[PDB]
């Protein structure tokens, strides 16, 4: 037989949301120890992982996703992956953006759910230049007043200090060209996009709601880190939630609303493309991923059946 090709399909996936075009972008993966980075029983944890056929031991392989949304008026990127801040298994968001047929120069707006390295570090090329040189970076103010504050980094423990530095470094090239905007709760950023506060995981963690043609998409950030356990058991928390209790409360609220409104979700650490719906179950919730499809423009003729 001939040589095995090996290479994986590129990490982009296209979906229509009304008139908006969504392109999910894969940053890569990180192996995360199931151990702690948790809040429940070891027997229950392994049982929940096994039923989703998720290997732990060597860690739970976890996706990192970003979302590119073309509304017609704006080309907006929601989160940016990790570049090389978390090692060589990540940082492929910009290459998947290009593979998907876009150019980073076309991005006019970057929305950050929060300033963790796996969301912000992709803002910057390896050589220090801004990855999206024409974009304005919108960061939640609470998120900015936390990670970008000098004393706060100093009164912080060593194992957390690097994340402060990476945040400062991710955002710096945009601050220097006056392209950094910390925003407050008021004023809806772009036509068709509104804010959904979801603090806890970080102090200003924010989810973004896109609406077009009667359809809704919540690009929710890090509401949840492990789909196999935290949908069934939302009470389970993550070691690196800055405030795990508040993060838990945001998740419980967002989970309930998403389930009852039946809106689309785009989740940064849900299996790529990270697009789908939340369904309420007997005890907790379940994740229902999109089924792979070309864009159904022909079906878009619900428009003539009005």
Q: Which of 27, 79, 118, 143 binds Zn ion (CB under 5 A)?
A: 118
CA–CA separation, 73 and 108 (whole Å)? 10
Which residue lies nearer to a second copy by CB, 201 or 269?
269
| Residue list 271-290, contact with a second copy (CB under 8 A) | 271-273, 276-277, 279, 288-289
φ/ψ of residue 44, rounded to 5: -70, -40
CA–CA separation, 218 and 264 (whole Å)? 6
Q: Does 108 bind a second copy (CB under 8 A)?
A: yes
Which residue lies nearer to Zn ion by CB, 118 or 138?
118
Q: Does 160 bind a second copy (CB under 8 A)?
A: no
In angstroms, give the least distance from the CB of 252 to a second copy: 21
| Residue list 216-275, contact with a second copy (CB under 8 A) | 262, 271-273
| Residue list 63-82, contact with a second copy (CB under 8 A) | 63, 70-75
H-state helical runs in the chain: 42-51, 93-99, 117-120, 141-147, 150-154, 158-176, 227-230, 244-261
Q: Does 1 bind a second copy (CB under 8 A)?
A: yes
φ/ψ of residue 85, rounded to 5: -60, -30
Backbone conformation region of residue 18, classed left if phi is above 0, alpha if psi is from -120 to 50, else beta: left
| Residue list 19-38, contact with a second copy (CB under 8 A) | 21, 23, 26, 28-29
Q: Does 189 bind a second copy (CB under 8 A)?
A: no
Partner from a second copy, Zn ion, none binding residue 295, C-beta < 5-8 Å depending on class = a second copy
Torsion of CA 194, 142, 123, 274, to 10 degrees: -50
Which residue lies nearer to Zn ion by CB, 163 or 255?
163
Q: Does 214 bind a second copy (CB under 8 A)?
A: no
Under 8 Å between Cβ of 173 and 125: no
Radius of gyration for the chain, computed over Cα atoms and rounded to the nearest angstrom: 19
Q: With CB under 8 A as the contact rule, which of the stretches 45-53, 199-207, 218-226, 239-247 interacts with a second copy?
A: 45-53
Q: Does 53 bind a second copy (CB under 8 A)?
A: yes
In angstroms, give the least distance from the CB of 248 to a second copy: 24
Angle formed at CA 103 by CA 98 and CA 108, multiple of 5 degrees? 135
In angstroms, give the least distance from the CB of 148 to a second copy: 29
Q: Does 296 bind a second copy (CB under 8 A)?
A: yes
Select from 161, 87, 169, 165 the least CA-distant residue to 123.
Answer: 169
Under 8 Å between Cβ of 227 and 63: no
Distances, alpha carbon 141 to alpha carbons 122, 129, 135, 278, in Å: 20, 24, 18, 29
Partner from a second copy, Zn ion, none binding residue 289, C-beta < 5-8 Å depending on class = a second copy
Residues engaged in binding a second copy (CB under 8 A): 1-2, 4-14, 21, 23, 26, 28-29, 51-54, 58, 61, 63, 70-75, 100-102, 106, 108, 262, 271-273, 276-277, 279, 288-289, 291-296, 299, 302
């Amino acid at each position: 037989a001939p040589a095995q090709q090996k290479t994986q399909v590129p990490g982009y996936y296209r979906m229509a949301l009304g008139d908006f075009e969504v392109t999910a972008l894969y940053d890569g993966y990180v192996d995360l120890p199931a151990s702690l980075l948790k809040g429940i029983d070891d027997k229950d944890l392994q049982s929940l992982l096994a039923r989703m056929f998720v290997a732990s031991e060597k860690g739970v392989q976890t996706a990192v996703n970003a979302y590119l949304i073309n509304t017609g008026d704006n080309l907006v990127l929601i989160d940016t992956g990790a570049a090389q801040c978390f090692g060589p298994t990540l940082g492929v968001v910009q290459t998947n953006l290009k593979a998907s047929g876009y150019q980073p120069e076309q991005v006019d707006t970057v929305l950050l759910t929060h300033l963790h390295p796996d969301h912000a570090c992709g803002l910057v090329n390896a050589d220090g230049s801004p990855a999206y040189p024409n974009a304005t970076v919108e960061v939640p103010q609470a998120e900015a007043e936390f990670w970008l504050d000098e004393a706060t980094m100093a009164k912080a423990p060593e194992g957390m200090q690097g994340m402060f530095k990476m945040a400062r470094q991710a955002v710096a090239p945009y601050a220097k060209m006056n392209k950094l905007k910390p925003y407050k709760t008021e004023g809806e950023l772009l036509p068709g996009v509104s804010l959904v506060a979801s603090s806890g995981h970080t102090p200003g963690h924010t989810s973004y709601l896109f609406k077009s043609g009667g359809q809704s998409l919540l690009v929710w950030g890090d509401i949840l880190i492990n789909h196999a356990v935290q949908f069934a058991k939302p009470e389970v928390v993550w070691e690196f939630d800055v405030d795990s209790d508040q993060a838990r409360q945001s998740r419980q609220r967002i989970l309930a609303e998403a389930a009852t409104d039946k809106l689309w979700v785009a989740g940064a650490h849900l299996p790529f493309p990270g697009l789908g719906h939340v369904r309420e179950e007997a005890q907790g919730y379940a994740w229902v991923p999109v089924e792979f499809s070309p864009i159904r423009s022909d079906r878009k003729l619900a428009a003539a059946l009005e």
